Amino acid sequence: PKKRASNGRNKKGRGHVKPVRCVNCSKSIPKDKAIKRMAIRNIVEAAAVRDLSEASVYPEYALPKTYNKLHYCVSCAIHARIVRVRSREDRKNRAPP
């Protein structure tokens, strides 16, 4: 062992899929299995934003974001501690926290 009633990932009726390359592995790897995350943070950071709305010529502007998705191999997903190893049972979960 089988491990994993899907298999790994996300594929059915669907036979074969357009793969993705890893940001990190820099491996290839289909858009099921994948393991995707939006960081999204303020370009700015906490410490400085105070020296920014300070010395700006803006009486405030706002604070524009920084968009991006992120693709991972499953290997580099665990090495980098994004995904862990959930006992057997805590697998068949699917919650953000």
Binding site: Y61, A62, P64, K65, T66, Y67
Partner: protein
């Protein structure tokens, strides 16, 4: 040697069809016996957010690409180059969980400019809508894109750049979409996103000097 002793400046103006004409400065570079400087850095663009122009803060995002058509005095006047969103705000408005659409259509204005425009537009849900979503069907989208085509050739013939420009500032095309669309589908966010030049014809100094006073 120094590479700022020689460096003569300049001033950037802008159509009048705008607010604070006043943009900041630029740097250029003098000449010799035979040979010239002014032309030597004209044709070129400058790109400034909608904002330091319309003054306003509602277009807080989105930038104007202007190009200097000719000099004077030190006050280099300007002709419209094109439009941009901030980026970011495009990549934000998109979510997971919902349909995304797309636009386009080229076009002989008449001023005889050739312009390509981009109308991105989403589905929105309903206010009151179990399901997690907000998707489209597909055939409805086919019908969605074709609508957009006409609604834009039409506000482009009915024309000019100057007359066109002040249909981009107050985002009035955005409205005209929603009211031919509702009589379908709900929609949100609806941009023009862009907008770029191609085949702009010959100078005509004042067809432009009539954009100032």
């Amino acid at each position: 040697v120094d590479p700022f002793t020689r460096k003569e400046w300049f001033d950037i103006k802008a159509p009048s069809t705008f607010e604070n004409a006043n943009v900041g400065k630029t740097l250029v570079n003098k000449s010799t016996g035979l040979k010239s400087a002014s032309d030597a850095l004209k044709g070129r663009v400058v790109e400034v957010c909608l904002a330091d122009l319309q003054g306003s803060e509602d277009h807080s995002f989105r930038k104007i690409k202007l190009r200097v058509d000719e000099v004077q005095g030190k006050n280099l006047l300007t002709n419209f180059h094109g439009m941009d969103f901030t980026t970011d705000k495009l990549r934000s408005m998109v979510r997971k969980w919902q349909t995304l659409i797309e636009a386009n259509v080229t076009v002989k204005t008449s001023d005889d400019y050739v312009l390509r425009i981009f109308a991105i537009a989403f589905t929105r849900a309903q206010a009151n809508q179990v399901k997690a979503h907000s998707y489209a069907q597909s055939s409805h989208i086919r019908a969605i894109r074709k609508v957009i085509s006409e609604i834009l050739t039409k506000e482009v013939q009915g024309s000019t750049l100057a007359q066109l420009t002040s249909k981009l500032i107050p985002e009035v095309i955005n409205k005209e979409i929603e009211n031919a669309t509702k009589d379908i589908f709900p929609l949100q966010n609806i941009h023009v996103r862009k907008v770029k030049l191609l085949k702009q014809p010959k100078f005509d100094v004042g067809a432009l000097m009539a954009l100032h006073g």
